[PDB]
Amino acid sequence: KKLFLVFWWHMHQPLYREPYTGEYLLPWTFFHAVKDYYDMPAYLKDFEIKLNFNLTPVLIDQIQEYAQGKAKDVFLEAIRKDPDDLEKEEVEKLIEFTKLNYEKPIYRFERIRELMNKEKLNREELLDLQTLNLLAWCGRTLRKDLKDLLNKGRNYTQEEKEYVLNKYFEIIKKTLSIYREIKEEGKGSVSTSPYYHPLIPILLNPNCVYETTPNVKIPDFAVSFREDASKHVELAKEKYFEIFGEHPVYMWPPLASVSNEALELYYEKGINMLATDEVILKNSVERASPYLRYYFRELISVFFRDKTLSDLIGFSYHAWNAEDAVRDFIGRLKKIHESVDFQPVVFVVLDGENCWEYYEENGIPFLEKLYSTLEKEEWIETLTLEEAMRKEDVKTEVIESVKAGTWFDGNFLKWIGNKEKNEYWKILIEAKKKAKNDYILVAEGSDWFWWQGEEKAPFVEVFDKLFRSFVRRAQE
Ligand SMILES: OC[C@H]1O[C@H](O[C@H]2[C@H](O)[C@@H](O)[C@@H](O[C@H]3[C@H](O)[C@@H](O)[C@@H](O[C@H]4[C@H](O)[C@@H](O)[C@@H](O[C@H]5[C@H](O)[C@@H](O)[C@@H](O)O[C@@H]5CO)O[C@@H]4CO)O[C@@H]3CO)O[C@@H]2CO)[C@H](O)[C@@H](O)[C@@H]1O
Ligand SMILES: OC[C@H]1O[C@H](O[C@H]2[C@H](O)[C@@H](O)[C@@H](O[C@H]3[C@H](O)[C@@H](O)[C@@H](O[C@H]4[C@H](O)[C@@H](O)[C@@H](O)O[C@@H]4CO)O[C@@H]3CO)O[C@@H]2CO)[C@H](O)[C@@H](O)[C@@H]1O
Protein backbone atom coordinates (compact mmCIF):
# COMPACT_ATOMS: atom_id res chain seq x y z
CA LYS A 1 0.00 0.00 0.00
CA LYS A 2 1.50 3.29 -1.11
CA LEU A 3 0.78 6.94 -0.41
CA PHE A 4 0.86 9.04 -3.57
CA LEU A 5 2.35 12.49 -3.08
CA VAL A 6 1.90 15.24 -5.67
CA PHE A 7 3.70 18.59 -5.35
CA TRP A 8 2.34 21.38 -7.57
CA TRP A 9 4.36 24.58 -7.21
CA HIS A 10 2.52 27.57 -8.72
CA MET A 11 4.57 30.42 -10.25
CA HIS A 12 3.02 33.77 -11.21
CA GLN A 13 3.66 37.51 -11.47
CA PRO A 14 1.15 40.11 -12.69
CA LEU A 15 2.30 42.35 -15.55
CA TYR A 16 4.67 44.98 -14.12
CA ARG A 17 5.32 46.58 -17.54
CA GLU A 18 3.63 49.97 -17.78
CA PRO A 19 2.07 50.15 -21.26
CA TYR A 20 2.88 53.74 -22.18
CA THR A 21 6.54 53.90 -21.08
CA GLY A 22 7.36 50.20 -21.31
CA GLU A 23 9.03 50.41 -17.91
CA TYR A 24 8.82 47.54 -15.41
CA LEU A 25 7.65 49.44 -12.33
CA LEU A 26 8.49 46.75 -9.77
CA PRO A 27 11.41 44.28 -9.91
CA TRP A 28 9.66 41.21 -8.48
CA THR A 29 9.80 39.16 -11.70
CA PHE A 30 13.56 39.70 -11.90
CA PHE A 31 14.16 38.90 -8.24
CA HIS A 32 11.99 35.77 -8.19
CA ALA A 33 13.46 34.55 -11.46
CA VAL A 34 17.01 34.73 -10.11
CA LYS A 35 16.02 33.34 -6.72
CA ASP A 36 13.24 30.80 -7.39
CA TYR A 37 12.00 30.26 -10.95
CA TYR A 38 15.15 28.53 -12.27
CA ASP A 39 16.12 26.94 -8.99
CA MET A 40 12.84 25.29 -8.00
CA PRO A 41 12.75 22.94 -11.04
CA ALA A 42 16.57 22.65 -10.97
CA TYR A 43 16.30 20.65 -7.74
CA LEU A 44 15.18 17.81 -10.05
CA LYS A 45 18.72 17.54 -11.46
CA ASP A 46 19.93 16.50 -7.98
CA PHE A 47 16.97 14.60 -6.47
CA GLU A 48 15.23 11.65 -8.12
CA ILE A 49 11.62 12.52 -7.27
CA LYS A 50 8.71 14.03 -9.24
CA LEU A 51 7.77 17.72 -8.83
CA ASN A 52 5.19 19.62 -10.84
CA PHE A 53 4.94 23.31 -11.71
CA ASN A 54 2.39 25.82 -12.93
CA LEU A 55 3.56 28.79 -15.02
CA THR A 56 1.12 31.57 -15.77
CA PRO A 57 1.38 32.90 -19.34
CA VAL A 58 1.81 36.49 -18.10
CA LEU A 59 4.81 35.33 -16.02
CA ILE A 60 6.29 33.56 -19.04
CA ASP A 61 5.96 36.74 -21.16
CA GLN A 62 7.96 38.71 -18.60
CA ILE A 63 10.68 36.08 -18.15
CA GLN A 64 11.09 36.12 -21.94
CA GLU A 65 11.43 39.91 -21.98
CA TYR A 66 14.11 39.88 -19.26
CA ALA A 67 15.94 37.01 -20.97
CA GLN A 68 15.95 38.98 -24.25
CA GLY A 69 17.53 42.06 -22.69
CA LYS A 70 14.34 44.04 -23.39
CA ALA A 71 12.98 44.71 -19.88
CA LYS A 72 13.48 48.30 -18.68
CA ASP A 73 13.35 47.66 -14.92
CA VAL A 74 13.46 50.97 -13.03
CA PHE A 75 14.52 49.47 -9.69
CA LEU A 76 17.22 47.36 -11.30
CA GLU A 77 18.53 50.47 -13.09
CA ALA A 78 19.06 52.01 -9.63
CA ILE A 79 21.01 48.93 -8.48
CA ARG A 80 23.19 48.87 -11.57
CA LYS A 81 24.25 52.57 -11.63
CA ASP A 82 27.37 53.86 -9.95
CA PRO A 83 26.13 55.44 -6.69
CA ASP A 84 27.55 58.81 -7.75
CA ASP A 85 24.78 58.78 -10.38
CA LEU A 86 21.88 57.79 -8.12
CA GLU A 87 18.94 60.21 -8.04
CA LYS A 88 17.55 61.24 -4.65
CA GLU A 89 14.36 59.35 -5.56
CA GLU A 90 16.43 56.23 -6.37
CA VAL A 91 18.31 56.32 -3.05
CA GLU A 92 14.96 56.63 -1.25
CA LYS A 93 13.54 53.64 -3.13
CA LEU A 94 16.66 51.53 -2.43
CA ILE A 95 16.34 52.29 1.29
CA GLU A 96 12.58 51.61 1.28
CA PHE A 97 13.14 48.32 -0.54
CA THR A 98 15.78 47.33 2.02
CA LYS A 99 13.49 48.22 4.94
CA LEU A 100 10.68 46.15 3.37
CA ASN A 101 12.92 43.04 3.26
CA TYR A 102 15.28 43.69 6.21
CA GLU A 103 13.83 41.10 8.60
CA LYS A 104 13.76 38.23 6.13
CA PRO A 105 16.57 35.66 6.68
CA ILE A 106 17.85 36.09 3.12
CA TYR A 107 18.75 39.66 4.18
CA ARG A 108 20.78 38.47 7.21
CA PHE A 109 23.95 40.46 6.52
CA GLU A 110 25.61 42.39 9.33
CA ARG A 111 26.56 45.11 6.83
CA ILE A 112 22.89 45.75 6.02
CA ARG A 113 22.30 46.36 9.73
CA GLU A 114 25.16 48.87 9.87
CA LEU A 115 23.97 50.68 6.73
CA MET A 116 20.38 51.04 7.94
CA ASN A 117 21.75 52.63 11.14
CA LYS A 118 23.61 55.35 9.24
CA GLU A 119 22.21 58.84 8.75
CA LYS A 120 23.72 59.39 5.29
CA LEU A 121 25.37 56.90 2.94
CA ASN A 122 28.54 57.68 0.97
CA ARG A 123 29.47 55.98 -2.32
CA GLU A 124 31.16 52.97 -0.69
CA GLU A 125 28.14 52.44 1.56
CA LEU A 126 25.65 52.74 -1.30
CA LEU A 127 27.63 50.23 -3.36
CA ASP A 128 27.32 47.83 -0.44
CA LEU A 129 23.60 48.52 -0.19
CA GLN A 130 23.05 47.90 -3.93
CA THR A 131 25.19 44.76 -4.04
CA LEU A 132 23.80 43.23 -0.86
CA ASN A 133 20.26 43.79 -2.11
CA LEU A 134 21.26 41.82 -5.21
CA LEU A 135 23.07 39.09 -3.28
CA ALA A 136 20.14 38.62 -0.87
CA TRP A 137 18.13 37.15 -3.77
CA CYS A 138 20.80 34.65 -4.84
CA GLY A 139 19.34 31.27 -5.80
CA ARG A 140 20.61 27.81 -4.87
CA THR A 141 22.64 27.30 -8.04
CA LEU A 142 24.63 30.51 -7.76
CA ARG A 143 24.98 30.34 -3.97
CA LYS A 144 27.78 27.84 -4.71
CA ASP A 145 29.46 29.99 -7.38
CA LEU A 146 29.05 33.28 -5.46
CA LYS A 147 29.88 31.89 -1.99
CA ASP A 148 33.02 34.06 -1.76
CA LEU A 149 31.06 37.24 -2.56
CA LEU A 150 28.24 36.29 -0.18
CA ASN A 151 30.78 35.73 2.59
CA LYS A 152 32.71 38.92 1.75
CA GLY A 153 29.86 40.83 3.37
CA ARG A 154 31.10 44.36 2.62
CA ASN A 155 33.35 46.61 0.51
CA TYR A 156 31.81 45.56 -2.81
CA THR A 157 33.05 47.20 -6.01
CA GLN A 158 31.09 48.30 -9.06
CA GLU A 159 32.92 45.55 -10.98
CA GLU A 160 31.70 42.88 -8.54
CA LYS A 161 28.13 44.17 -8.72
CA GLU A 162 28.23 43.98 -12.53
CA TYR A 163 29.64 40.44 -12.31
CA VAL A 164 26.70 39.39 -10.12
CA LEU A 165 24.21 41.01 -12.51
CA ASN A 166 25.82 39.13 -15.41
CA LYS A 167 25.48 35.80 -13.59
CA TYR A 168 21.88 36.58 -12.69
CA PHE A 169 20.94 37.25 -16.30
CA GLU A 170 22.55 33.94 -17.29
CA ILE A 171 20.13 32.24 -14.86
CA ILE A 172 17.20 34.15 -16.32
CA LYS A 173 18.23 33.10 -19.84
CA LYS A 174 18.15 29.42 -18.75
CA THR A 175 14.86 29.59 -16.83
CA LEU A 176 12.29 28.55 -19.45
CA SER A 177 14.71 25.86 -20.64
CA ILE A 178 14.80 24.10 -17.27
CA TYR A 179 10.99 23.75 -17.25
CA ARG A 180 11.08 22.27 -20.71
CA GLU A 181 13.95 19.98 -19.71
CA ILE A 182 12.28 18.48 -16.66
CA LYS A 183 9.01 17.99 -18.58
CA GLU A 184 10.87 16.27 -21.41
CA GLU A 185 12.77 14.09 -18.91
CA GLY A 186 9.55 12.92 -17.26
CA LYS A 187 10.58 14.42 -13.93
CA GLY A 188 7.58 16.72 -13.67
CA SER A 189 4.49 17.99 -15.39
CA VAL A 190 4.18 21.67 -16.30
CA SER A 191 0.71 23.24 -16.31
CA THR A 192 -0.56 26.72 -17.02
CA SER A 193 -3.43 28.99 -15.91
CA PRO A 194 -5.86 31.25 -17.76
CA TYR A 195 -3.62 33.90 -19.18
CA TYR A 196 -3.59 36.85 -16.76
CA HIS A 197 -4.56 34.86 -13.65
CA PRO A 198 -8.17 36.14 -13.33
CA LEU A 199 -11.05 34.95 -11.13
CA ILE A 200 -12.81 32.88 -13.79
CA PRO A 201 -15.96 32.15 -11.72
CA ILE A 202 -16.66 35.86 -11.28
CA LEU A 203 -16.07 36.59 -14.98
CA LEU A 204 -18.51 33.82 -15.91
CA ASN A 205 -21.20 34.59 -13.35
CA PRO A 206 -20.65 37.33 -10.74
CA ASN A 207 -23.73 36.11 -8.86
CA CYS A 208 -21.73 33.09 -7.74
CA VAL A 209 -20.27 35.26 -4.92
CA TYR A 210 -23.62 34.91 -3.10
CA GLU A 211 -23.17 31.13 -2.72
CA THR A 212 -20.69 31.54 0.18
CA THR A 213 -21.29 35.21 1.15
CA PRO A 214 -25.01 35.83 0.57
CA ASN A 215 -24.95 39.22 2.32
CA VAL A 216 -22.08 40.70 0.31
CA LYS A 217 -22.58 43.85 -1.76
CA ILE A 218 -21.05 43.85 -5.23
CA PRO A 219 -21.29 46.32 -8.12
CA ASP A 220 -23.73 46.21 -11.01
CA PHE A 221 -22.16 43.87 -13.58
CA ALA A 222 -24.01 45.53 -16.46
CA VAL A 223 -21.76 43.92 -19.12
CA SER A 224 -20.81 40.32 -19.88
CA PHE A 225 -17.32 39.01 -19.06
CA ARG A 226 -18.13 35.47 -20.22
CA GLU A 227 -16.25 35.78 -23.53
CA ASP A 228 -13.24 37.23 -21.69
CA ALA A 229 -13.21 34.18 -19.41
CA SER A 230 -13.05 31.93 -22.50
CA LYS A 231 -10.32 34.11 -24.02
CA HIS A 232 -8.10 33.83 -20.92
CA VAL A 233 -8.29 30.05 -21.22
CA GLU A 234 -7.84 29.94 -25.00
CA LEU A 235 -4.90 32.36 -25.00
CA ALA A 236 -3.23 30.30 -22.27
CA LYS A 237 -3.63 27.15 -24.37
CA GLU A 238 -1.96 28.99 -27.25
CA LYS A 239 0.92 30.19 -25.06
CA TYR A 240 1.40 26.67 -23.69
CA PHE A 241 1.49 25.36 -27.26
CA GLU A 242 4.12 28.01 -28.18
CA ILE A 243 6.36 26.95 -25.28
CA PHE A 244 5.88 23.16 -25.25
CA GLY A 245 4.43 22.36 -28.67
CA GLU A 246 1.46 20.46 -27.22
CA HIS A 247 -1.90 21.57 -25.89
CA PRO A 248 -2.37 21.35 -22.11
CA VAL A 249 -4.77 18.87 -20.53
CA TYR A 250 -4.41 20.19 -16.99
CA MET A 251 -4.53 23.71 -15.59
CA TRP A 252 -4.20 25.34 -12.23
CA PRO A 253 -7.27 27.55 -11.61
CA PRO A 254 -6.05 30.82 -10.10
CA LEU A 255 -6.56 31.01 -6.33
CA ALA A 256 -7.92 27.43 -6.58
CA SER A 257 -11.08 29.17 -7.76
CA VAL A 258 -13.84 27.02 -9.17
CA SER A 259 -17.59 27.09 -9.72
CA ASN A 260 -19.95 24.85 -11.65
CA GLU A 261 -19.74 27.13 -14.69
CA ALA A 262 -15.94 27.41 -14.43
CA LEU A 263 -15.51 23.64 -14.33
CA GLU A 264 -17.77 23.39 -17.38
CA LEU A 265 -15.60 25.96 -19.21
CA TYR A 266 -12.36 24.14 -18.43
CA TYR A 267 -13.86 20.88 -19.71
CA GLU A 268 -15.14 22.56 -22.89
CA LYS A 269 -11.61 23.85 -23.59
CA GLY A 270 -10.11 20.36 -23.30
CA ILE A 271 -8.86 20.43 -19.72
CA ASN A 272 -9.22 16.93 -18.23
CA MET A 273 -7.86 17.62 -14.74
CA LEU A 274 -7.40 20.44 -12.25
CA ALA A 275 -6.94 20.86 -8.53
CA THR A 276 -8.67 23.16 -6.04
CA ASP A 277 -8.89 23.61 -2.27
CA GLU A 278 -10.07 21.48 0.64
CA VAL A 279 -12.37 24.25 1.94
CA ILE A 280 -14.31 24.18 -1.32
CA LEU A 281 -14.62 20.39 -0.96
CA LYS A 282 -15.99 20.79 2.56
CA ASN A 283 -18.48 23.41 1.34
CA SER A 284 -19.66 21.29 -1.62
CA VAL A 285 -19.63 17.60 -0.65
CA GLU A 286 -20.84 15.72 2.42
CA ARG A 287 -17.92 13.26 2.73
CA ALA A 288 -15.02 15.61 2.13
CA SER A 289 -12.00 13.32 1.89
CA PRO A 290 -9.18 15.15 0.09
CA TYR A 291 -7.41 11.86 -0.74
CA LEU A 292 -9.55 10.68 -3.68
CA ARG A 293 -9.60 11.44 -7.37
CA TYR A 294 -12.97 13.17 -7.91
CA TYR A 295 -14.87 13.43 -11.20
CA PHE A 296 -16.97 16.55 -11.53
CA ARG A 297 -20.14 15.34 -13.29
CA GLU A 298 -18.02 12.46 -14.65
CA LEU A 299 -16.40 14.95 -17.09
CA ILE A 300 -13.29 16.51 -15.48
CA SER A 301 -10.98 15.06 -12.82
CA VAL A 302 -10.56 17.18 -9.71
CA PHE A 303 -8.14 16.78 -6.82
CA PHE A 304 -8.43 18.81 -3.65
CA ARG A 305 -5.17 19.89 -2.04
CA ASP A 306 -4.36 18.95 1.54
CA LYS A 307 -4.65 22.43 3.00
CA THR A 308 -2.90 21.58 6.26
CA LEU A 309 0.27 20.25 4.56
CA SER A 310 0.24 23.07 1.98
CA ASP A 311 -0.06 25.71 4.70
CA LEU A 312 2.70 24.16 6.85
CA ILE A 313 5.17 24.63 4.01
CA GLY A 314 3.78 28.04 3.14
CA PHE A 315 3.48 29.50 6.64
CA SER A 316 4.87 27.26 9.43
CA TYR A 317 8.15 25.59 8.49
CA HIS A 318 10.13 28.75 7.71
CA ALA A 319 10.53 29.07 11.49
CA TRP A 320 11.56 25.45 12.24
CA ASN A 321 14.92 23.75 12.23
CA ALA A 322 14.94 22.16 8.78
CA GLU A 323 15.40 18.56 9.95
CA ASP A 324 12.52 18.87 12.43
CA ALA A 325 10.16 20.36 9.83
CA VAL A 326 10.95 17.44 7.50
CA ARG A 327 10.35 14.91 10.30
CA ASP A 328 7.02 16.62 11.06
CA PHE A 329 5.99 16.52 7.40
CA ILE A 330 6.92 12.86 6.87
CA GLY A 331 5.23 12.00 10.17
CA ARG A 332 1.98 13.59 9.03
CA LEU A 333 2.15 11.64 5.74
CA LYS A 334 2.65 8.44 7.73
CA LYS A 335 -0.50 9.24 9.74
CA ILE A 336 -2.49 9.73 6.51
CA HIS A 337 -1.09 6.45 5.17
CA GLU A 338 -2.17 4.60 8.32
CA SER A 339 -5.59 6.31 8.57
CA VAL A 340 -7.16 5.06 5.31
CA ASP A 341 -7.63 1.59 3.87
CA PHE A 342 -6.90 2.59 0.23
CA GLN A 343 -3.93 4.29 -1.45
CA PRO A 344 -4.42 8.03 -0.74
CA VAL A 345 -3.46 10.77 -3.15
CA VAL A 346 -2.10 13.82 -1.34
CA PHE A 347 -1.86 17.06 -3.32
CA VAL A 348 0.44 19.73 -1.85
CA VAL A 349 -0.25 22.92 -3.81
CA LEU A 350 0.91 26.46 -3.02
CA ASP A 351 2.81 29.39 -4.47
CA GLY A 352 6.22 28.14 -5.50
CA GLU A 353 8.25 31.36 -5.03
CA ASN A 354 6.83 33.34 -2.06
CA CYS A 355 7.59 31.35 1.10
CA TRP A 356 11.34 30.64 0.75
CA GLU A 357 12.60 34.15 1.52
CA TYR A 358 11.38 33.62 5.11
CA TYR A 359 13.41 30.41 5.53
CA GLU A 360 17.05 30.17 6.55
CA GLU A 361 19.27 30.17 3.43
CA ASN A 362 16.20 30.67 1.19
CA GLY A 363 14.74 27.28 2.10
CA ILE A 364 17.68 25.33 0.69
CA PRO A 365 18.39 23.25 3.85
CA PHE A 366 14.68 22.47 4.18
CA LEU A 367 14.10 21.47 0.54
CA GLU A 368 17.35 19.52 0.23
CA LYS A 369 16.47 17.58 3.34
CA LEU A 370 12.84 17.09 2.34
CA TYR A 371 13.67 15.84 -1.15
CA SER A 372 16.58 13.68 0.00
CA THR A 373 14.24 12.09 2.57
CA LEU A 374 11.42 11.47 0.09
CA GLU A 375 13.98 9.84 -2.22
CA LYS A 376 14.38 7.12 0.40
CA GLU A 377 10.79 6.32 1.47
CA GLU A 378 9.47 3.05 0.01
CA TRP A 379 5.84 3.72 0.96
CA ILE A 380 5.67 7.21 -0.64
CA GLU A 381 5.61 7.58 -4.43
CA THR A 382 5.81 11.12 -5.76
CA LEU A 383 3.80 11.53 -8.98
CA THR A 384 3.65 13.77 -11.99
CA LEU A 385 0.29 15.35 -12.82
CA GLU A 386 -0.05 12.96 -15.75
CA GLU A 387 0.61 9.99 -13.44
CA ALA A 388 -1.93 11.25 -10.89
CA MET A 389 -4.54 11.68 -13.64
CA ARG A 390 -4.07 8.11 -14.91
CA LYS A 391 -3.29 6.14 -11.72
CA GLU A 392 -5.61 3.15 -11.60
CA ASP A 393 -5.18 1.88 -8.02
CA VAL A 394 -6.71 4.94 -6.31
CA LYS A 395 -10.12 5.63 -4.83
CA THR A 396 -12.56 7.83 -6.75
CA GLU A 397 -15.92 9.54 -6.30
CA VAL A 398 -18.31 11.63 -8.39
CA ILE A 399 -19.20 15.21 -7.42
CA GLU A 400 -22.28 16.81 -8.94
CA SER A 401 -22.04 20.41 -7.67
CA VAL A 402 -19.51 22.74 -6.06
CA LYS A 403 -20.00 25.92 -4.04
CA ALA A 404 -18.04 28.67 -5.80
CA GLY A 405 -15.06 30.01 -3.92
CA THR A 406 -11.30 30.31 -3.61
CA TRP A 407 -8.61 28.95 -1.33
CA PHE A 408 -9.09 32.02 0.93
CA ASP A 409 -11.82 30.83 3.32
CA GLY A 410 -13.72 29.32 0.36
CA ASN A 411 -15.06 32.74 -0.70
CA PHE A 412 -14.25 35.80 -2.77
CA LEU A 413 -13.97 38.51 -0.11
CA LYS A 414 -10.27 39.26 -0.68
CA TRP A 415 -11.10 40.45 -4.23
CA ILE A 416 -14.64 41.86 -4.07
CA GLY A 417 -17.30 43.02 -1.62
CA ASN A 418 -15.90 46.11 0.08
CA LYS A 419 -16.02 49.72 -1.07
CA GLU A 420 -12.46 49.94 -2.36
CA LYS A 421 -12.35 46.56 -4.10
CA ASN A 422 -15.80 47.18 -5.56
CA GLU A 423 -14.45 50.43 -7.03
CA TYR A 424 -11.99 48.41 -9.13
CA TRP A 425 -14.77 46.18 -10.44
CA LYS A 426 -16.89 49.25 -11.28
CA ILE A 427 -13.95 50.71 -13.21
CA LEU A 428 -13.43 47.44 -15.06
CA ILE A 429 -17.14 47.14 -15.88
CA GLU A 430 -17.23 50.65 -17.37
CA ALA A 431 -14.01 50.11 -19.33
CA LYS A 432 -15.17 46.75 -20.69
CA LYS A 433 -18.10 48.52 -22.34
CA LYS A 434 -15.59 50.60 -24.33
CA ALA A 435 -12.66 48.15 -24.59
CA LYS A 436 -10.67 47.96 -27.84
CA ASN A 437 -7.82 45.52 -27.14
CA ASP A 438 -6.57 42.76 -24.85
CA TYR A 439 -5.33 45.13 -22.16
CA ILE A 440 -8.84 44.65 -20.76
CA LEU A 441 -7.71 41.07 -20.08
CA VAL A 442 -4.58 42.26 -18.27
CA ALA A 443 -6.80 44.39 -15.99
CA GLU A 444 -8.85 41.30 -15.12
CA GLY A 445 -5.91 39.71 -13.27
CA SER A 446 -6.60 38.87 -9.64
CA ASP A 447 -3.57 40.71 -8.27
CA TRP A 448 -4.97 44.22 -8.73
CA PHE A 449 -8.07 43.44 -6.68
CA TRP A 450 -6.00 41.66 -4.02
CA TRP A 451 -3.88 44.73 -3.23
CA GLN A 452 -6.69 47.24 -3.42
CA GLY A 453 -8.37 48.46 -0.31
CA GLU A 454 -6.02 47.10 2.17
CA GLU A 455 -3.87 48.82 4.79
CA LYS A 456 -1.43 51.19 3.11
CA ALA A 457 1.96 49.56 2.42
CA PRO A 458 5.22 50.32 0.68
CA PHE A 459 5.05 50.11 -3.14
CA VAL A 460 1.46 48.93 -3.21
CA GLU A 461 0.41 52.19 -4.89
CA VAL A 462 2.36 50.95 -7.92
CA PHE A 463 -0.20 48.16 -8.36
CA ASP A 464 -2.93 50.81 -8.52
CA LYS A 465 -0.97 52.77 -11.16
CA LEU A 466 -0.50 49.62 -13.26
CA PHE A 467 -4.16 48.53 -13.02
CA ARG A 468 -5.44 51.95 -14.02
CA SER A 469 -2.88 52.28 -16.82
CA PHE A 470 -4.01 48.96 -18.30
CA VAL A 471 -7.66 50.05 -17.99
CA ARG A 472 -6.83 53.29 -19.83
CA ARG A 473 -4.82 51.55 -22.53
CA ALA A 474 -7.65 49.03 -23.02
CA GLN A 475 -9.95 51.79 -24.26
CA GLU A 476 -7.51 53.27 -26.83
O1 LIG B 1 2.71 43.25 7.39
C1 LIG B 1 2.31 43.71 6.12
C2 LIG B 1 2.53 42.60 5.11
O2 LIG B 1 3.91 42.34 5.03
C3 LIG B 1 4.20 41.42 3.99
O3 LIG B 1 3.69 41.92 2.73
C4 LIG B 1 4.74 42.59 2.08
C5 LIG B 1 5.84 41.58 1.73
O4 LIG B 1 6.69 41.18 2.79
C6 LIG B 1 6.79 42.18 0.73
O5 LIG B 1 7.56 41.09 0.30
C7 LIG B 1 6.07 42.77 -0.47
O6 LIG B 1 5.36 41.72 -1.16
C8 LIG B 1 5.66 41.75 -2.54
C9 LIG B 1 6.18 40.37 -2.88
O7 LIG B 1 7.38 40.13 -2.15
C10 LIG B 1 6.46 40.36 -4.38
O8 LIG B 1 7.06 39.16 -4.80
C11 LIG B 1 5.16 40.62 -5.16
O9 LIG B 1 4.28 39.52 -4.87
C12 LIG B 1 3.84 38.83 -6.06
C13 LIG B 1 4.11 37.35 -5.83
O10 LIG B 1 5.53 37.14 -5.69
C14 LIG B 1 3.56 36.52 -7.01
O11 LIG B 1 3.83 35.13 -6.82
C15 LIG B 1 2.05 36.79 -7.12
O12 LIG B 1 1.45 36.31 -5.95
C16 LIG B 1 0.11 35.87 -6.10
C17 LIG B 1 0.15 34.34 -6.28
O13 LIG B 1 0.65 33.95 -7.55
C18 LIG B 1 -1.25 33.73 -6.10
O14 LIG B 1 -1.27 32.33 -6.07
C19 LIG B 1 -1.84 34.23 -4.79
O15 LIG B 1 -1.19 33.74 -3.64
O16 LIG B 1 -1.96 35.62 -4.76
C20 LIG B 1 -0.71 36.29 -4.88
C21 LIG B 1 -1.04 37.79 -4.92
O17 LIG B 1 -1.85 38.11 -6.05
O18 LIG B 1 1.86 38.17 -7.34
C22 LIG B 1 2.32 39.03 -6.29
C23 LIG B 1 2.03 40.47 -6.70
O19 LIG B 1 0.62 40.55 -6.88
O20 LIG B 1 4.64 41.87 -4.76
C24 LIG B 1 4.37 42.01 -3.34
C25 LIG B 1 3.81 43.42 -3.09
O21 LIG B 1 4.80 44.35 -3.54
O22 LIG B 1 5.16 43.75 -0.01
C26 LIG B 1 4.15 43.23 0.82
C27 LIG B 1 3.17 44.34 1.17
O23 LIG B 1 3.85 45.58 1.11
C28 LIG B 1 3.55 40.07 4.28
O24 LIG B 1 3.87 39.09 3.31
C29 LIG B 1 2.05 40.23 4.46
O25 LIG B 1 1.47 39.01 4.87
C30 LIG B 1 1.81 41.31 5.50
O26 LIG B 1 0.43 41.54 5.64
O1 LIG C 1 2.80 37.35 7.30
C1 LIG C 1 3.77 37.68 6.33
C2 LIG C 1 4.12 36.32 5.81
O2 LIG C 1 4.61 36.16 4.44
C3 LIG C 1 4.77 34.76 4.07
O3 LIG C 1 3.52 34.29 3.67
C4 LIG C 1 3.48 34.06 2.29
C5 LIG C 1 3.53 32.57 2.07
O4 LIG C 1 4.76 32.10 2.53
C6 LIG C 1 3.41 32.29 0.58
O5 LIG C 1 3.36 30.93 0.42
C7 LIG C 1 2.16 32.97 0.01
O6 LIG C 1 1.06 32.39 0.65
C8 LIG C 1 -0.03 32.13 -0.23
C9 LIG C 1 -0.25 30.65 -0.05
O7 LIG C 1 0.84 29.96 -0.66
C10 LIG C 1 -1.55 30.15 -0.64
O8 LIG C 1 -1.76 28.89 -0.09
C11 LIG C 1 -2.68 31.09 -0.25
O9 LIG C 1 -2.84 30.99 1.16
C12 LIG C 1 -4.18 30.77 1.57
C13 LIG C 1 -4.13 29.64 2.57
O10 LIG C 1 -3.78 28.46 1.91
C14 LIG C 1 -5.47 29.46 3.24
O11 LIG C 1 -5.35 28.66 4.39
C15 LIG C 1 -6.03 30.75 3.77
O12 LIG C 1 -5.38 31.17 4.93
O13 LIG C 1 -5.97 31.79 2.81
C16 LIG C 1 -4.72 32.02 2.23
C17 LIG C 1 -4.87 33.25 1.32
O14 LIG C 1 -5.63 33.06 0.12
O15 LIG C 1 -2.37 32.43 -0.62
C18 LIG C 1 -1.27 32.92 0.10
C19 LIG C 1 -1.09 34.43 0.01
O16 LIG C 1 -0.68 34.81 -1.29
O17 LIG C 1 2.26 34.34 0.35
C20 LIG C 1 2.19 34.59 1.74
C21 LIG C 1 2.12 36.08 1.90
O18 LIG C 1 2.82 36.47 0.72
C22 LIG C 1 5.36 33.86 5.22
O19 LIG C 1 5.27 32.51 4.97
C23 LIG C 1 4.63 34.19 6.51
O20 LIG C 1 4.85 33.33 7.63
C24 LIG C 1 5.08 35.58 6.75
O21 LIG C 1 5.02 35.89 8.12
UniProtKB/TrEMBL annotation:
Keywords assigned by UniProt, alphabetized: Carbohydrate metabolism
Domain of life, per lineage: Bacteria
Coiled-coil parts of chain: none
Parts of the chain that traverse the membrane: none
The keyword Cytoplasm appears for this protein: no
InterPro entries on file: GH57_Enzymes, Glyco_hydro/deAcase_b/a-brl, Glyco_hydro_38_N_sf, Glyco_hydro_57_N
Domain Glycoside hydrolase family 57 N-terminal, residue spans: 6-397
GO BP term, example: carbohydrate metabolic process
GO MF annotation, one: catalytic activity
This protein's record includes keyword Metal-binding: no
Annotated family: Belongs to the glycosyl hydrolase 57 family.
Protein name: Glycoside hydrolase family 57 N-terminal domain-containing protein
